[PDB]
Amino acid sequence: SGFRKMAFPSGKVEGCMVQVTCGTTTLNGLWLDDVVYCPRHVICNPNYEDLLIRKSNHNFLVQAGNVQLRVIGHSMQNCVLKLKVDTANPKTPKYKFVRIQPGQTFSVLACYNGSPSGVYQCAMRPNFTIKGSFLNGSCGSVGFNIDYDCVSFCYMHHMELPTGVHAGTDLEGNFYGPFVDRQTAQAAGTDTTITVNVLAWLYAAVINGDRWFLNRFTTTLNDFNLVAMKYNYEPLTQDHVDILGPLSAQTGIAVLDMCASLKELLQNGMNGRTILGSALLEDEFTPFDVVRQCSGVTF
Amino acid sequence: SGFRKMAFPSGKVEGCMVQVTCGTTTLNGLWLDDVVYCPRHVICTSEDMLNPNYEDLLIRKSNHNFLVQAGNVQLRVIGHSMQNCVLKLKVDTANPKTPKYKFVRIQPGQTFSVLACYNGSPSGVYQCAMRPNFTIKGSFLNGSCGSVGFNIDYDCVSFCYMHHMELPTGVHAGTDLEGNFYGPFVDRQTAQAAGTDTTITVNVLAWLYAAVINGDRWFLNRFTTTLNDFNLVAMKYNYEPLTQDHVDILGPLSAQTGIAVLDMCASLKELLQNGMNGRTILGSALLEDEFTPFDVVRQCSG
Ligand SMILES: NC(=O)N1Cc2ccc(Cl)cc2[C@H](C(=O)Nc2cncc3ccccc23)C1
Ligand SMILES: NC(=O)N1Cc2ccc(Cl)cc2[C@H](C(=O)Nc2cncc3ccccc23)C1
Numbered sequence: 001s002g003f004r005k006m007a008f009p010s011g012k013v014e015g016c017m018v019q020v021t022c023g024t025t026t027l028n029g030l031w032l033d034d035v036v037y038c039p040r041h042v043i044c045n046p047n048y049e050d051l052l053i054r055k056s057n058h059n060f061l062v063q064a065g066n067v068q069l070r071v072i073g074h075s076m077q078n079c080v081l082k083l084k085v086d087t088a089n090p091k092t093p094k095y096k097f098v099r100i101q102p103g104q105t106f107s108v109l110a111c112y113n114g115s116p117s118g119v120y121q122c123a124m125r126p127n128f129t130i131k132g133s134f135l136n137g138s139c140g141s142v143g144f145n146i147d148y149d150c151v152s153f154c155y156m157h158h159m160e161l162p163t164g165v166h167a168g169t170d171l172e173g174n175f176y177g178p179f180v181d182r183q184t185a186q187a188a189g190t191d192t193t194i195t196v197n198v199l200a201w202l203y204a205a206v207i208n209g210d211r212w213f214l215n216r217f218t219t220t221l222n223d224f225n226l227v228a229m230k231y232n233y234e235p236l237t238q239d240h241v242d243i244l245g246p247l248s249a250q251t252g253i254a255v256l257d258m259c260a261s262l263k264e265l266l267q268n269g270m271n272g273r274t275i276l277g278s279a280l281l282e283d284e285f286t287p288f289d290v291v292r293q294c295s296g297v298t299f
Numbered sequence: 300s301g302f303r304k305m306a307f308p309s310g311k312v313e314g315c316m317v318q319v320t321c322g323t324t325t326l327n328g329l330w331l332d333d334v335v336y337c338p339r340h341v342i343c344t345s346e347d348m349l350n351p352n353y354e355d356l357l358i359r360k361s362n363h364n365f366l367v368q369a370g371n372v373q374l375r376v377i378g379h380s381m382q383n384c385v386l387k388l389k390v391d392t393a394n395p396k397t398p399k400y401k402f403v404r405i406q407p408g409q410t411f412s413v414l415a416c417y418n419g420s421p422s423g424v425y426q427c428a429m430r431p432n433f434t435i436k437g438s439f440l441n442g443s444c445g446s447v448g449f450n451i452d453y454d455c456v457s458f459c460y461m462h463h464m465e466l467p468t469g470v471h472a473g474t475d476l477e478g479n480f481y482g483p484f485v486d487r488q489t490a491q492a493a494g495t496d497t498t499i500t501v502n503v504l505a506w507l508y509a510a511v512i513n514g515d516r517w518f519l520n521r522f523t524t525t526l527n528d529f530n531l532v533a534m535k536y537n538y539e540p541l542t543q544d545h546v547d548i549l550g551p552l553s554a555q556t557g558i559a560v561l562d563m564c565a566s567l568k569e570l571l572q573n574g575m576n577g578r579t580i581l582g583s584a585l586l587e588d589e590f591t592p593f594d595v596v597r598q599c600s601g
């Protein structure tokens with residue numbers, strides 16, 4: 001029993017964190033094989049080709065623990081700088097670079113000076129920001145998932161928006177969201193609630209013995225989506241309904257039956273009650289996160 | 300900016316997780332140097348659990364009865380001893396991944412990271428607090444016994460918890476790494492219930508200071524309180540008494556935000572009276588009590 005916001009064990013990622021210093025700027029890098037990936041704003045109206053062409057290999061100081069790595073090459077791929085180093089990371093795990101969709105969750109290994117300080121779980125918001133916890137020096141910290149023994153890198157931290165939320169890229173340097181890596185006026189779009197995730201979390205509450213919110217009612221996908229649109233909830237697709245199938249079979253509560261529970265919660269509130277120790281509807285657990293935590297999958 | 304429930308990077312602990320098998324029971328062990336620490340109930344059957352005589356059960360065991368597995372490698376047990384409710388299995392190989400470590404016993408209200416494991420394999424990491432009733436509100440399934448709680452301040456891992464059991468309310472009970480249970484619990488299938496839980500007051504105050512550091516002041520008021528008046532009010536909401544030690548501990552946060560501890564106590568009293576009125580504090584509609592004053596300083600400042 002119990003339901004926690006749980007991150008993947010960060011060990012395979014910790015063994016990849018390095019410190020990248022260039023000029024006055026110091027941030028984090030991800031050392032995989034003989035390449036260190038880091039935000040290109042470490043070289044810093046920025047013409048990044050012009051700024052990068054003025055740098056030599058020895059301008060980038062890469063530090064892996066108490067060992068200085070020597071940079072033998074450098075190239076840019078979108079908003080990510082790839083520093084070729086002489087040494088292949090012996091701690092390089094089996095990995096992939098994956099781009100995630102909004103609503104998908106991942107673990108963040110927050111780092112400062114190439115040293116991991118914390119690990120937390122978070123979701124790619126529908127507005128492409130992440131509600132993370134980062135201070136200055138956190139740039140280059142990575143987001144990942146673990147599938148079997150393979151680490152899928154999905155996020156690299158680049159910046160903080162004026163509302164305190166965060167923006168970054170996939171490991172190929174493509175930003176999530178309409179953001180750019182420069183000091184210009186940028187704001188996160190109006191956020192919405194990840195509906196399939198709230199439903200997954202209601203199923204987790206049912207699995208954990210909390211059923212007060214259940215009701216005899218059902219609804220249609222169209223009628224539920226008319227309610228979802230009114231409460232700034234993401235539309236629930238047939239794919240989401242299919243994805244919630246296993247949880248629906250396990251608890252005996254059809255996805256449209258759980259949708260009517262969610263509809264009543266949105267219109268009437270919780271009425272002094274909590275669900276899994278929360279007075280708000282939690283949307284940062286995917287259906288797979290719920291199944292994984294309520295089954296004990298290991299890595 | 301931002302405030303998350305953050306766990307310590309689990310890497311130093313992952314490299315210590317092993318699987319311990321005794322008969323039909325399989326649980327997790329912590330391999331540090333040449334010793335594997337695990338709950339002593341690994342030697343029990345389901346029947347033995349009502350009134351186990353651990354000394355009697357352990358005396359009938361030999362080293363080769365304990366199967367220890369570190370990854371895809373079987374370790375050889377060369378000795379065994381019991382220290383309180385933990386079994387210490389001397390093995391023939393020192394763990395090369397043994398980090399700098401300490402065994403620390405924590406007090407209620409203290410937080411720590413839990414590396415939940417099944418079959419000696421880590422599956423997840425989460426942050427939690429030792430409740431005032433000595434239980435932890437964890438996320439544990441059958442086979443998670445032996446999973447550990449820790450903090451990693453600097454490069455040293457301080458092991459503070461080993462999971463032993465789930466109580467009937469879904470909460471968890473365990474021991475420090477010397478085998479001493481937190482709380483009035485026993486490693487027996489007997490009628491045991493967690494005492495009435497209370498809110499960790501000093502932690503809620505620390506979290507209100509984190510909200511101030513992050514720019515949220517909506518809950519502040521023009522009032523102050525005496526420590527005694529705060530405790531009389533707080534007790535009525537099932538909040539732990541706030542001691543002078545807690546007030547002293549909140550000193551740095553008070554100096555940083557410019558809000559006196561007893562002035563922050565007055566905001567808390569008002570929040571308990573009024574609720575949040577549709578608002579949130581650090582993305583939460585409830586008063587969060589699983590961040591200590593030390594956690595707030597670490598995360599908000601560095
Ligand atoms: N003004 C300022 O501090 N920045 C400007 C800027 C402009 C563009 C880009 Cl791509 C990055 C940055 C950096 C950034 O956002 N870094 C930071 C990242 N995360 C959390 C922070 C908390 C506090 C301060 C910086 C954080 C630095
Ligand atoms: N009923 C049952 O299976 N147990 C009884 C028991 C009695 C005393 C002692 Cl010291 C340990 C145990 C074990 C224990 O609590 N393990 C478990 C630990 N954590 C979460 C669990 C979730 C679900 C089932 C067991 C969990 C095993």
Ligand SMILES: [Cl-]
Nearest residue numbers: 404405406409
């Ligand atoms: Cl303590």
